Ligand binder design. Structure first.
Ligand SMILES: C[C@H](O)[C@H](O)[C@H]1CNc2nc(N)[nH]c(=O)c2N1
Ligand SMILES: C[C@H](O)[C@H](O)[C@H]1CNc2nc(N)[nH]c(=O)c2N1
Ligand SMILES: C[C@H](O)[C@H](O)[C@H]1CNc2nc(N)[nH]c(=O)c2N1
Ligand SMILES: C[C@H](O)[C@H](O)[C@H]1CNc2nc(N)[nH]c(=O)c2N1
Lengths: 423, 423, 423, 423
């Protein structure tokens, strides 16, 4: 499978999800309680609760180095004060919700936690000397920055040239509509020629010009939780390296072309973007088991999905649209095609290298979105999630908070629509 | 009054907002049209319709150098292709929608479109040179950049100190809760103390973490149209300069103390943000005729409003909470009180530097949002608008798409709600 | 005032509104509960939850013979099974919701709960015997039956003739359009001429073909509660008797002319029907406290209202359009005019037989519906209601179902709308 | 197939769908135009247009006997006045929309237009003498009446006894949930014992007590248009006859038991009722071709459908739940099961007698409702349809009328839901 079990750092990450009502002593109480225990107060951030006017939300920017007193604080918090605390832990210790980044800026803690001799071009010291350099670029990037741009060598340029020569000529009849729609634009705007390599930054900015989707330089393949969690933030982690000039149509681990020809152009569609994003949102705080299940879904859908299209069936898989041979295989009559169903799609085993025998076809991305949200209602976590586009932080919602926020949001949509009724 | 009519630049600003449905030649026709007539493509960016999968949307960043060629382009768009074209013009000539920005970045285009001997300290060279310094800072600032942090002199530090000493001790009973709650946060977080000035950047970061609202350093005062459009983007144009030490409770032009102590803390509540933003949206495409009325609203609502608050009447005006005398004058039997109703609230003359005879009271900011939106449904503009938080572009909507977009979005929201109903 | 407090019958009316979720024994438990304690099943009807597939809804048609046994049943329902029970009582004792009908057929239960020497014609035996005749007709009429058609004497025919002669010639400029349009229809269709009386049955048929509104022959005057509940069912309780020939423009108790010329023609517009019906629904479960206010509304709105109508102010009141003098008094500079706002419109004392000093003006009936519904959201009753047009039973809604039912219904409506958008 | 081509009567039915704006001369113009041409004015009914306050709708109760002048009237109507007229014709003559009943009362014109020697019990004069008697009962029924009740013979009673003995014992594990839910209620309420025959009227009234669904006595099998059109009105036409005592488990033409055990109990569920009803609504004014397609759908769904149910697949077909042998066959592993899709389901051929080889399974009835409405968007008719629950007439909607009615209806639902947001 494509599931990669997740890791941790020795310091770790112990966050405390809790909101607090402006009670007698409260905001003084908490921050003094922390600075008595040596906890830095650059790391105890509090902002208001966007729902109950009289409450705040608290973000604790910590690690396991605070353990000699982190017990005690929790002790006082849940039982001496009466604040509902959920602890995020990356070590996945005693019945502790699995850690995840909480703001779009917290992605830098565990973004470099990725990656055999048989790699194509292995005994070439040149390709490896280039590969550690590109990993370095991902090692030094911090959120907010523009992606540092690299002049690509030319042998790599014609590797892309060949792959593009094949795939372009073959997309017009193989790719989904939303791909033939975006791709001419990428060509004329970003530098998506068969004779030119685009820089990650420009593509990032274009995807933000279409959907607010962002490209983040990652050295390699991250653990499923981190990958799908970053996708929650409308952030796609992508690679900067190319395949070897010897074998331009096989890579065991995804390269520049897989993203630019498999993922990105569809990331320029809002319907598909939100589709992927909802899965992202659902991935966080989820059990490792359900992360295996998410990985399975992602594979048979994002990486290798098909879409019903009025008259045709077409491929929206990112591995489908990036691998010339399997893009031939896919619409051939060989493989299996059935209307997508997650009850089975999760319980669907697959292979990593071999051409995937069976495929699953959606109606439109939005129906798949509905289905994803449905399955999200199945993942067991003692709270809900929903993403804030402006603040770029994930609203962790409880019983009472889901209610007023959805209520009034739909009220505003209701108002604008009721005015749309008056022509 | 404080209403300011809008002006133009030598270059100008000619946009052609139009979308086009993907037929063979359509987008080819347009991109042919520009470079056939030599128009630069540094400014003609076309992206997909975030709504109709089969359409593109066109933002044309143009100017009056296209006047030597715009006739032909308009004609071919309106009649040879059949595209509904709305031309945005800042010259506001025959059949021209009054210009406004479509991108979060088009606010830098008209950020320098701003701004007397009786000022206390007019011939004081130090206050003059410092005001030219701050005008320079606002002159060269472009969106996305960090707000440069400025070292304040001591006279300015204690002028702020005095203003704060007076107003802070008073707020506990005059400001709305949404202020009495937020201010404890701002004090200890951004530096809203009596002996220290926060730098706009830090406050901006706080405000986007709360509401996606942003602080923009602006020279003097910008036309009503431009100010309120920037507020539509959840971007607040704000001042970095301080008042003179001679008269610490009189400033003719809004200053650091007025912005940080009158406006910001209320900009820290989402409900208030939605209120102001909905007004902003109503400003876009609006004629100067009803923009006089809009400025009036802002005055009597954001700057000089009162709000029903459970038991009492309280001040949420940014000018009430920034001018010490009128905050008491307003909470007395002296002034007159009228229930906010836009039939009258817009139609009401006023003066700027005056203890306001009458005030207007809201119920909660949300209902005020509703009233603003309702009255906005009355301004005649040949389309409505609503802002895309991720892309930071305002979806300009015609008849056909408004319904499909809100209908389906609410389809998703009500689905998740119907499933949440079963606990 | 014209407000009438409600009374009770010797039998009474004890309903227990409750639904129950289909577990083994649940519905078995209840049906066991009744016949274990001997209660008759001519009145205990259980039907499915039109909303939650897995639940039943229970309408229990009971009386005070169950007082010798209701204690046990209530207890077992509230604590041994765990069913949310709301008991409807017309005795309105401790912890009793004030009684109201759940079925379109429960209106016959309290249809005889109605009704002086100074009447012109009091000791006239002919008018007396005729009023006892019409009271008998209303006494034995049950819903569903055809309204018996009655042969009128000649004095009654020309009393009607005179009233009509006067008011008809005048309506062309005093009544709302929704009256000036409908009346041409009623004249030629039902027999609304100066020489002929329509029989309630024919008008009823007309009114259900327009609005589902129905004419019910009622003896004298029914308590405010009962009248307005019947109006909730889109059923109008109406009079079949005429006034005396002595005073053709004075009647203390509403008569055929008042109903057919004041009320009905406006009951022929759907928007007005929705207005009155929403009020009706608000009456259900309402305490007498706010029902005084409801009666006041009906008076100042349905019976004595004015409406903004594009350019002018016009009368849609049923008492304005039925009492010739006050229709002119009202359209003059004599009376006072106040914009309909329920904060004041409910809170306002009045007298019955009086040229009304002040009047209230609406914008359109639909907005008045909104205001009624809004103020209804203020009455404290332990559930909301909305009427099922096909079943002719009012869905009594608790928290959990309201959302799933309207959410999904609107899901369907917005789907068909989104598909209609493409022409 | 189960499609039966439709017939006509010699008089026929020429109706004219048109609305009219209150223009100079209008309402006098039309009715005088008709009475000049001998057209009875009991047959020219006009009521108001429920949308445009200034318009009426006109129903012409005619036949082909008006032909010697029906040309001329149409002549003046469409081209001399400018009223959009759509002619309904049952003969399906020159490009004339196929006739259908317009009110729930117009069903009596063509309700008796139904129905080989091999019928079971044919040479028994007793069964035929009974069969013409039951057809007579359907021949003499007119809308509004209660269904005349018959004392059933006893041999027929034990035919029902045997069929019930088998099917009841076999339903608890074969029938869909919504059947095991309703059926105990029918047992205890209507007289659904294995030892007793229910009278059509009581079942009708029960189905109206659940969903407003009604049972109308029909002599035999009607043409598809009339059957599905009656189902639009929430009216199910049903048979009063039984099978022969010789062979109680085979009938070529549906009998009492098929409805009471196949159709009715599901007609007591609102979700299923609306499901069937929307198809009904869609059937009217549809091409004969698409009536063949509708018949196909009805067969594979209503008569022989399955439903996905969380854990199981269960039968909701009316022939499935009425035929003991095929109810065994259905969940056996023999037949084919695929997720229902109307693109194919219509183009799905079948057999009349033989056990249907393949079956189609829905998720829940509502999803099938969505699908039906979707396919309805494909039937070609120059107007839309939507059913009025109160007036019990089908709103024929044009471009402009669909808009305001759906707009404001959803506005009301929006209001009630927005108030549900305030708890
Ligand atoms: C989601 C699933 O685990 C899938 O294999 C992930 C794994 N990690 C990844 N890591 C990177 N860098 N890029 C990817 O596309 C993926 N895909
Ligand atoms: C909104 C209203 O027009 C008000 O007068 C505006 C005018 N332009 C402005 N310009 C600046 N720089 N600052 C302000 O506060 C205002 N206020
Ligand atoms: C609705 C208001 O309470 C008003 O006084 C009611 C009272 N009861 C009534 N009873 C009858 N029979 N007829 C009426 O018009 C009224 N009006
Ligand atoms: C809808 C389809 O035509 C189906 O065979 C109809 C035909 N006519 C009918 N006629 C009657 N009386 N009852 C039915 O169930 C049907 N079914």
């Amino acid at each position: 499978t494509s599931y990669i079990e997740d890791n941790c750092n020795q310091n770790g990450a112990i966050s405390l999800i809790f909101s607090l009502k402006e009670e007698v002593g409260a905001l003084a109480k908490v921050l003094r309680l922390f600075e008595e225990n040596d906890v830095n107060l650059t790391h105890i951030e509090s902002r208001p609760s966007r729902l109950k006017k009289d409450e705040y939300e608290f973000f604790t920017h910590l690690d396991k180095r605070s353990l000699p007193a982190l017990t005690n604080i929790i002790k006082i918090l849940r039982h001496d004060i009466g604040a509902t605390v959920h602890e995020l832990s990356r070590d996945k210790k005693k019945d502790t919700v699995p850690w995840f980044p909480r703001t779009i800026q917290e992605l830098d803690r565990f973004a470099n936690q990725i990656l055999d001799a048989d790699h194509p071009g292995f005994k070439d010291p040149v390709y490896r000397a280039r590969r550690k350099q590109f990993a370095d670029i991902a090692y030094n990037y911090r959120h907010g920055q523009p992606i540092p741009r690299v002049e690509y060598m030319e042998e790599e340029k014609k590797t892309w040239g060949t792959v593009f020569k094949t795939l372009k000529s073959l997309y017009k009849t193989h790719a989904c509509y939303e791909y033939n729609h975006i791709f001419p634009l990428l060509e004329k705007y970003c530098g998506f020629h068969e004779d030119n390599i685009p820089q990650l930054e420009d593509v990032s900015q274009f995807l933000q010009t279409c959907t607010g989707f962002r490209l983040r330089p990652v050295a390699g393949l991250l653990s499923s939780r981190d990958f799908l969690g970053g996708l929650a933030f409308r952030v796609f982690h992508c690679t900067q390296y190319i395949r070897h000039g010897s074998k331009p149509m096989y890579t065991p681990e995804p390269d520049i072309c897989h993203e630019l020809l498999g993922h990105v152009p569809l990331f320029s569609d809002r319907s598909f973007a939100q589709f992927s994003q909802e899965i992202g949102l659902a991935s966080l705080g989820a059990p490792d088991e359900y992360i295996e299940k998410l990985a399975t879904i992602y594979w048979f859908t994002v990486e290798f999905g098909l879409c019903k299209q009025g008259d045709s069936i077409k491929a929206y898989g990112a591995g489908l649209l990036s691998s010339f041979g399997e893009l031939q295989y896919c619409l051939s009559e060989k493989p299996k095609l059935l209307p997508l169903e997650l009850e089975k799609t999760a319980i669907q085993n697959y292979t990593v290298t071999e051409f995937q025998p069976l495929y699953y076809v959606a109606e439109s991305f939005n129906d798949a979105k509905e289905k994803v949200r449905n399955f999200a209602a199945t993942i067991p976590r003692p709270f809900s999630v929903r993403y804030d586009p402006y603040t770029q932080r994930i609203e962790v919602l409880d019983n009472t908070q889901q209610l007023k926020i959805l209520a009034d949001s739909i009220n505003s949509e209701i108002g604008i629509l009721c005015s749309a009724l008056q022509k």
